[PDB]
């Protein structure tokens, strides 16, 4: 309503091309996501270990 | 990027000179010629990994990285394949024994194994003449921003 | 010195040489962050989680008591608000005079004082926007301030 | 379980203040509290003093025992003045050609293990002021002012707490109570 | 005058002094631990306080905001602490 | 204040927005208050009176209009009537019944 | 908004020496005063001074003898060659055979003197005599 688009084939290119680049958006957020969950868990696991360490894996060989 | 999908021209795209025979079936059908421009400037995975030509770029292209290393900032990437940095300074001057800030701009070929942005710092070699003003080549990046996206998400 | 007007006011708080302190203080540093987040789950802001905790409890200064600023215990339990307190409170202000003087377009003092507190929220936007507490393409716009005061 | 609470085999010092240790809670709660090394130091006139080093995590519930724990190890290894401490790691400032490695915390900066150091020498007088006397000689010299409350525990140890700060630091050092 | 300890002056000639303006600032406010007649609960309450405090086990005004120090309610034990 | 208390309750609670929800919620006896506009058609409010007196539920009656209404809620579009069927950390029903 | 901490110390301690007094206050502190004024300790034109230990900055109080006239501030702090310092001490210094040009090096704040001996250079701070 613009103009913004000469014809069709101009405003099929610029449909691709932001296609393209909301993919790569989305692709980056999801890994991002991924790699803080999975830091999230391991460092709640380190908490259950070290945590549980003071209480019951101080007392029976070492 | 680029979105050449490779052979977005009217002639074909390809290295001159690299010659991939249809009839040896080798098992890679990548058949690429990248060169270490020099320098201690790492030539990038997505050069050696890419589809793309570009023929000026100083790894897979046929210039040559000779003369003057300098440094800038990107304040344009609105043509295809170049970029405008700014490359600021301090000018002396002995009558005041003080300095002025001065700027040249100074327009630079990228290749297409570089994602540059406005703000990124960049490191940019002398080449041969390969336009009109454009006498440079971007060999290497530093963006100045650590991905700082989610910072804009805010709720 | 007073960045828009003149004054020279030297107002403040003074802030004690201990800081580890005051030697009478029950109420653990785990106890009092339990506070401030039912506090902050009430609806409250540092400043006055703050002073709620010093005048109705001895809690003196939260970085001495715990070792963290509010702002980071709430933004630490996930309470964070969307813009800082002092944007928001400017942008409030802004909001009730701009309100005012379409109610009254005769008022040239609070056409004068709008424009000084807009200049305020630009210049801490600007701020914010380069410690990135806001987004970039962030902008204070007065025709949805009541949509962004939200 | 009295190697347990050395950390680290050395030796008859460390190992008599460990059954001091044992011997005193054979009477709490201070079996999890264990430290690592052990410094004897002099003192210009008289005695010798001790340095008990300590993970810093450890010094909140080292710092509820030490007037009920000290007491008793002025009175049992006496001739001496101990005093306790935390290890706290100094690491270098960078310099501009040296690669770089991570920010270097203000806690593991130099002047804060420092004051530190101090704070701890010093223990429940809540040290109120500090000076800095330079003199012509280009030398320093620091008062540090103590509050007169639970003075009388310390009022003793002036001076094993200079010598101290200045084997430790190798800066000079003084105290003052105002009255 | 011409010659002085600005180092160890008077506490008469500090107490008087802006609290800023000492040789090393601190607050010149305060704490206290207040019961009301009713309750023997302690309740710790800053001299200037900026809000109406009120006692946790009888819901009741003990000290009420001014332009400097908590106006305390009627007759109530107060101590500084 | 009844502007900051809604405001709480916009991000901790539970509401609905607009007449028929409203309505809906009433008929199932979930709501609690009901917020209503000045500028509403007074048709609009008598229904929502009645529908309230017939659910034992509390009306408050915003001094502002639908515009005012939305704003206060949170929104860019304007409401002539909220329903409040679950407060959060809020105070809003005991501050003035 | 104080823009040199080492400016507003300088014209305290001139002001005082011009009235006689033998002790100045001046806050903020900075190493660079600490450095200024211990070059002037060890020439003799300051007494002792004591950095107080407030947890903002610093207040220092100097015991001051009377033996100064002038401790003054190039602002800006310009850069100096080697070649330039006689320039500088020509134009601001009473005479050859005493005062001190104060500048800072990448060997440390120093007199002149001390900067011709090392055979360094640097940026110019101010001047004692």
């Known amino acids: 309503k613009g103009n913004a688009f000469k014809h069709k084939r101009a405003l099929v290119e610029h449909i691709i091309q932001a296609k393209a680049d909301a993919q790569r958006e989305k692709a980056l957020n999801e890994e991002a996501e991924a790699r803080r969950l999975k830091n999230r868990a391991a460092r709640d696991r380190r908490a259950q270990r070290v945590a549980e360490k003071r209480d019951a894996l101080l007392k029976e060989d070492a | ?17 690299i010659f991939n025979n249809p009839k040896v079936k080798t098992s890679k059908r990548t058949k690429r010629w990248y060169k270490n421009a020099g320098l201690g400037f790492k030539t990038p995975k997505t050069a050696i990994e890419g589809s793309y030509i570009d023929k000026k770029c100083p790894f897979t292209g046929l210039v040559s990285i000779r003369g003057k290393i300098l440094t800038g900032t990107v304040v344009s990437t609105k043509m295809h394949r170049t970029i405008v940095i700014r490359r600021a300074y301090l000018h002396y001057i002995p009558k005041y024994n003080r300095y002025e800030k001065r700027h040249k701009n100074v327009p630079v070929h990228v290749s297409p194994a570089f994602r540059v942005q406005v703000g990124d710092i960049v490191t940019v070699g002398q080449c041969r003449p390969i336009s009109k003003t454009v006498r440079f080549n971007v060999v290497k990046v530093s963006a100045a921003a650590g991905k700082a996206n989610k910072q804009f998400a805010k709720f | ?10 107002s403040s708080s003074a802030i004690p040489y201990s800081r580890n302190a005051p030697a009478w203080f029950k109420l653990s540093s785990e106890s009092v962050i339990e506070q401030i987040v039912k506090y902050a789950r009430k609806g409250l802001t540092p400043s006055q989680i703050g002073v709620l905790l010093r005048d109705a409890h001895g809690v003196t200064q939260a970085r001495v008591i715990t070792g963290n600023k509010i702002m980071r215990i709430l933004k630490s339990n996930g309470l964070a608000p969307e813009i800082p307190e002092d944007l928001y409170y400017l942008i409030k202000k802004a909001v009730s005079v701009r309100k005012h003087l379409e109610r009254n377009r005769k008022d040239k003092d609070a056409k004068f004082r709008l424009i000084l507190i807009e200049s305020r929220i630009h210049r801490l936007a600007r701020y914010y926007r380069t410690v990135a507490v806001l987004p970039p393409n962030w902008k204070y716009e007065s025709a949805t301030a009541s949509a962004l005061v939200n | 379980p009295q ?3 050395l950390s680290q085999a050395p030796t008859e010092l460390e190992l008599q203040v460990a059954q001091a240790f044992v011997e005193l809670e054979n009477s709490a709660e201070l079996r999890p509290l264990q430290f690592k090394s052990i410094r004897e130091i002099d003192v210009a006139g008289g005695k010798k003093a001790l340095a008990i080093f300590v993970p810093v995590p450890s010094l909140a519930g080292f710092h509820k025992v030490q007037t009920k724990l000290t007491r008793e190890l002025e009175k049992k290894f006496q001739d001496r003045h101990v005093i306790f401490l935390a290890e706290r790691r100094i690491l270098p400032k960078p310099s501009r050609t040296s690669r770089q490695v991570q920010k270097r915390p203000r806690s593991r900066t130099l002047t804060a293990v420092h004051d530190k150091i101090l704070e701890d020498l010093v223990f429940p007088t809540e040290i109120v002021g500090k000076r800095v006397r330079y003199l012509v000689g280009g030398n320093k010299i620091q008062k540090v002012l103590l509050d007169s409350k639970d003075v009388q525990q310390i009022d003793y140890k002036l001076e094993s707490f200079q010598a101290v700060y200045n084997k430790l630091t190798g800066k000079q050092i003084v105290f003052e109570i105002p009255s | 005058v011409l010659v002085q300890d600005l180092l160890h002056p008077t506490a008469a000639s500090e107490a008087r002094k802006h609290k800023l303006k000492t040789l090393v600032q601190g607050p010149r406010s305060y704490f206290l631990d207040v019961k009301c007649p009713g309750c023997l609960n302690i309740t710790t309450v800053f001299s200037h306080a900026q809000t109406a405090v009120t006692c946790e086990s009888c819901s009741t005004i003990l000290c009420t905001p001014t332009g400097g120090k908590a106006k305390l309610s009627e007759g109530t034990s107060f101590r500084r602490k | 204040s009844i502007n900051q208390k809604l405001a709480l309750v916009i ?25 209503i506009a000045a500028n509403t058609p007074v048709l609009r409010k008598s229904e929502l009176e009645y529908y309230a007196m017939l659910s034992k539920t509390k009306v408050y009656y915003f001094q502002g209009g639908n515009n005012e209404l939305g704003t206060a809620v949170g929104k860019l579009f304007r409401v002539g009537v909220v329903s409040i069927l679950e407060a959060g950390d809020s105070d809003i029903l005991t501050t003035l019944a | 908004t104080r823009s040199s901490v080492l400016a507003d110390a300088l014209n305290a301690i001139n002001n005082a020496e011009k009235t006689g007094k033998r002790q100045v206050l001046i806050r903020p502190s900075s190493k660079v005063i600490i450095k200024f004024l211990q070059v002037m300790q060890k020439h003799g034109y300051i007494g002792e001074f004591e950095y107080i230990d407030d947890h903002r900055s610093g207040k220092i109080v100097v015991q001051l003898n009377g033996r100064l006239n002038k401790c003054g501030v190039i602002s800006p702090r310009f850069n100096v060659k080697i070649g330039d310092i006689e320039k500088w001490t020509a134009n601001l210094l009473p005479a050859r055979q005493f005062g001190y040009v104060i500048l800072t090096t990448s060997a440390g704040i120093m007199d002149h003197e001390e900067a011709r001996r090392k055979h360094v250079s640097g940026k110019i701070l101010g001047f004692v005599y």
Do not use: C
């Open chain 2, 1 to 17: 990027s680029t979105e050449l999908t490779v052979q977005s021209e009217r002639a074909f795209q390809k290295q001159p000179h």
């Open chain 3, 1 to 10: 010195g007073r960045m828009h007007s003149a004054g020279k006011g030297i």
């Open chain 4, 3 to 5: 190697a347990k609470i």
């Open chain 6, 11 to 35: 991000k901790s609670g539970k509401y609905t927005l607009g007449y028929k929800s409203t309505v809906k919620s009433l008929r199932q006896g979930k709501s609690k208050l009901i917020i």
